[PDB]
Amino acid sequence: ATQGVFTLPANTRFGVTAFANSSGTQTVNVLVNNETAATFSGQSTNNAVIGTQVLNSGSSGKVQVQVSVNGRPSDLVSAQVILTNELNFALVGSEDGTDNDYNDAVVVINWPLG
Amino acid sequence: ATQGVFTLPANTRFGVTAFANSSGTQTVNVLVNNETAATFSGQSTNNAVIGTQVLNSGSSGKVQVQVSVNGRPSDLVSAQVILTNELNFALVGSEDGTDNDYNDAVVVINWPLG
Ligand SMILES: *C(=O)C[C@@H]1O[C@@H](C)[C@@H](O)[C@@H](O)[C@@H]1O
Ligand SMILES: *C(=O)C[C@@H]1O[C@@H](C)[C@@H](O)[C@@H](O)[C@@H]1O
Ligand SMILES: [Ca+2]
Ligand SMILES: [Ca+2]
Ligand SMILES: [Ca+2]
Ligand SMILES: [Ca+2]
């Protein structure tokens, strides 16, 4: 099934943050309305933040997260969680190798802000 | 019900990251084995990271997140979500006022690392 695609409320500010836990350099692309709005790149095996950004969901609200390592797309896992019917989380995990820990690039999207 | 308390695997490294979305300074306390392991403090209305760190779940694996503003404890919402039976997220939201957006301090715990 398709992973890493989330439908946010339109024209809403959201935060996106990426962590790295891999020997390979992780590249995270954040797509809004099917067009690249942010790109994070970095390497770390200690959960270092390779990028954090505030974006706008745009007119369609469609937000897609893509992860790649040296041009090869990573396998993604994703889910959305809503707490007390207000606080939203869009979580993405990714695997670039064989150990299947799916933390090589961890992307957290949270909204609302402010 | 009790919120902000998660049972992690024992002696396991985990990342903890806090965001701020409020006019008040957020004080986030991360407890391990009922003892304060880390304290984040900052103010932001644009989802700025007021703290990110790698900690150890300890001999019991008990991790508690506490949030307070000007000494007054905030109301917490929390849940844990596991993706592909391996990737773990512990999420915390907090409310310091009356608008009930529960993003004033957002804490995300993720494991495993590396
Ligand atoms: C090799 O590059 C694979 C890779 O890096 C390891 C340090 C570990 O994080 C593994 O999960 C990751 O896929
Ligand atoms: C005011 O101090 C309350 C406070 O700050 C606002 C800017 C908004 O973020 C609100 O949710 C927060 O509780
Ligand atoms: Ca991996
Ligand atoms: Ca890894
Ligand atoms: Ca609030
Ligand atoms: Ca707020």
Neighbours of ion ligand 5 (CB under 5 A): B 95, 97, 99, 101, 104
Burial B15-48 (b: 16+ CB within 10 A, else e): bbbbbbbbebbbbbbbbbeeeebbebebebeebe
Residue of chain A nearest B89, judged by CA positions = A91
Which ligand sits nearest to residue B100's alpha carbon? 5
PDB experimental method: X-ray
Q: Write the single-letter amino acid at A5.
A: V
Torsion over CA of A64, B49, B40 and A48, rounded to 10 degrees?
70
Residue of chain B nearest A111, judged by CA positions = B103
CA B75 to centroid of ligand 4, rounded, Å: 34
Q: For ligand 1, atom 12, which residue shows the shortest CA distance?
A: A22
Tokens of A63: 């937000």
A111: chain B residues, CB-CB within 8 Å: 103
Classify strands A62-69 and A13-32 as parallel, antiparallel or unpaired. antiparallel
> Where do the domains of chain A lie?
1-114
φ/ψ (deg, to 5) at B74: -90, 155
What secondary structure letter does DSSP report for A103?
B
The CB density around residue A111, as the number of other CB atoms within 10 Å, is: 27
Cα separation, A38 vs A52, in Å, equals 9
Q: What is the resolution of this structure in A?
A: 2.0
What secondary structure letter does DSSP report for B9?
P
